Structure of Multidrug resistance protein MdtB:
Amino acid sequence: MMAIALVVMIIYLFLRNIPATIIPGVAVPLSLIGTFAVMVFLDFSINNLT
Amino acid sequence: TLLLSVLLWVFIPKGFFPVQDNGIIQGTLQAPQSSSFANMAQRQRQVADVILQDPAVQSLTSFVGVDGTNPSLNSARLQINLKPLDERDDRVQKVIARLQTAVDKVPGVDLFLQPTQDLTIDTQVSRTQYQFTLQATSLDALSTWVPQLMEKLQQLPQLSDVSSDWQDKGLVAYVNVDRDSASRLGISMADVDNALYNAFGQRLISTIYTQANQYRVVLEHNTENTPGLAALDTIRLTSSDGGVVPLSSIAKIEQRFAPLSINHLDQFPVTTISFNVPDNYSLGDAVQAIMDTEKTLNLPVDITTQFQGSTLAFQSALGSTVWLIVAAVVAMYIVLGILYESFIHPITILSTLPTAGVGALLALLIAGSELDVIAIIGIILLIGIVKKNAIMMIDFALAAEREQGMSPREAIYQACLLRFRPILMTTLAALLGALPLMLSTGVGAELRRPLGIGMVGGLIVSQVLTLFTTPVIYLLFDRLALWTKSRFARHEEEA
Amino acid sequence: AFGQRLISTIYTQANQYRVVLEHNTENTPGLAALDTIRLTSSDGGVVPLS
Amino acid sequence: LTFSLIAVLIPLLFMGDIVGRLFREFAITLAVAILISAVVSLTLTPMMCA
Amino acid sequence: LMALTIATGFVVDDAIVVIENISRYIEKGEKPLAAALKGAGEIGFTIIS
Amino acid sequence: YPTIQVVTLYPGASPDVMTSAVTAPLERQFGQMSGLKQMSSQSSGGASVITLQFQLTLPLDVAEQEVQAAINAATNLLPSDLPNPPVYSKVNPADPPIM
Amino acid sequence: TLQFQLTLPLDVAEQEVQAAINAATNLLPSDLPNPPVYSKVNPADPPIMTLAVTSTAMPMTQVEDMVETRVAQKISQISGVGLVTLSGGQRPAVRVKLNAQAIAALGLTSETVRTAITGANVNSAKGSLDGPSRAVTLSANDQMQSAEEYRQLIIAYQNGAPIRLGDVATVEQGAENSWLGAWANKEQAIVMNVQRQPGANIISTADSIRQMLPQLTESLPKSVKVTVLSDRTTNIRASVDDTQFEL
């Protein structure tokens, strides 16, 4: 969460684009949370290594 | 960069897996050979009174006796626990040091703490830093030659704290029934064995059946009334004449020495030897010291050796590494040639990979971090990011060269000028991504703390070399491509 | 008597040997070896198989 | 870059032994994360930014 | 073993047919790259057939 | 890893008689079974646990079948005063407890 | 010999044969020396390579003991061995020879010597001691290994004269079954056969046992010479290299 928050803040400060600020805070959690969907067919278990 | 890559790869200390502080410590308690249940129990009670006094420890778990885990009657295994992260004040090293110097003061006791780990590969739990096995052919010969390897192998400076799980000073009582004297009263060896077993054998004979459970009936003899080995001759044995015949008239009693445990390897008697290597010597010095000792002792020709653990893991890693690197480099050459449809462009991309290795190895040597296989993976990811930004600049360089047709030097100039901002956003993203691993101070941090420093060193070294070397070396590779085109023309002309 | 019967066991340090019972046939050749076997009796004597 | 990046992980997942098995999960987890991120980048961001 | 021994001819036949088309477009004397491209285009359907 | 632990507790028996009457028969019975790469035994007073580590190619089910077959075939030679028959365990030392 | 339908997997058939052999155990005769064991071997499977061991000046019983203690197990230790069948097993054992006339003269039956021998060697639990100071384990010389102690046992009594096993019967080291044996060409020997493992390379395994062939010969006593008589890797090599040359 702090990695995403810092990324969003630095993008907003650097490129001064509010649209460029809305994209990451939703895309990155969407990709990371939605990542396991393909993992279902693999049937691996989240662990310390994961 | 290439030469220092080889030099540092040889110079950096390596590691197999790292140690972790989850909060439990497993220790083993050792007791003299003549130990019994009362003595071992009272000693456990005294230690439990001593270890619990420490503020960092919160509970004890200890079970002794004959089971599938404990090794002997006098040998006790302890499972110590600690408070979680937010309440105690010191880490695993200092807490275990305080625990070890706390019990040493206690008389008559000795306890071997080894901090337990999470991922275990060895089938046994080690006691000291290293352990190995010695294989022989017979119990008696290896038993009689056990003292030689304690009294002659202990004095090598490279080899310290020599110890083995086998102890051959155990007290055993022997009864010698006379074969000729037994035939006079009509008693056989079977009667003697049955009498001794049902006298002092804790024999289970009868069964109790209940509504739902099943209890057992056990036979035991009293020893309180008559202390000492004088309890053995009070047992009687039946006779054909009908009377009772004492064991004194048909047998004699002797005391001898037998081992408390027999351990076997490959259908031959074996010893497991564990010890500590001095930090001033490496495992190579230790194993060569074992070599000259086993050569000098003039051991029986039926004494061989076998080792396990770090040596096998490191040999397997060495066997796998060269083939892994060769196959990987071939794979990158193939895919990059597919992406660029050229011969020397992938070599231009492949030439920037080793630069990150120098930074990673320099950082890990400076950071004093163990080079576990996780560190090797981190170096691999560093090289991957380096090749990622390298491709980022080269793609636009080639696109500009093919579109504008401008000379290559101004082409790479324009490509670098239009792609510089991507370089710093990527670098900042990598720096913020590696920042948590640098300041990781929580649970499991031993498995992420060195990675941050390694990645940060790899990244800053890689960008410092990239931003100032890539364009001109790419122009030099284009000049070499022109010379190879000259070579193609020649090989088509005079060949 | 003539069964090559395996009756007793021998226990050693690592191996396990067996004890086997057999009768001699060299002294008395032919089927006349069969009637030399004795059998116990309630009266206590030996009674021939004949 | 998506195709070229997997070339690093293409050989790693095929090493055997305990180290190979325990890094197999890491390798394919990274690969699936990269592929899903690529798909999200080429699908969602063009529309949000259009 | 015997499967591979017999399949040697089957494997060589594909090289035979591609060299056949290329030799066809080489003997008459057409432009090299154009002849190879046109031959591959015209007989690519036959080989897959 | 393919590793089978079998336990045989028999009270009162001295370590040497435990080694002679318990470990030797099953050790000879287990040794002839395929897939065995190395074996080690922890024989003490009244206890006999057997450590078998197999090759990486052996599936766990087939190894359980062989250990069951061996423990059944060696039953006659075992001492007749065993309180419980010996039972196998599909437990590797790498597996930790839950709680 | 049981031949099943084509649809039965081998594992399930092994489960049924194990279950049947367990369920029929009670009805089996009670004097069986070994319980019956199943074999997952089809007649189509050929052996990998056969080894035969012979000797010149040392009795065959100790030759067989020596070979199945060190030679057979180390060779079988590596992969590539399905089942080593030591054909013609002259397994070592202890034999007792009964004189009919002598024992019949004294009026004693074979039941008496049977009871004496049964009651002689019994190695059972003897237990241990517990006390306030020291603990010990009880062990007695109730176990005899060689033949002299079996010979010295007293097995009958008759007017004061001690009647032993030696003075009325003969005992000598020999084989467990006199009807098992193997012959190698012109001399006598012991032969063992090595089966195969599915999915295993044969040439490499044969090269491995060839590599440990000399290590055992130096380890074997000087009077023992081991030899090989049959194999199939040579025909496999001939087939593959002939195919290569032809192509």
Observations:
- The two ends of chain A are 18 Å apart (CA to CA).
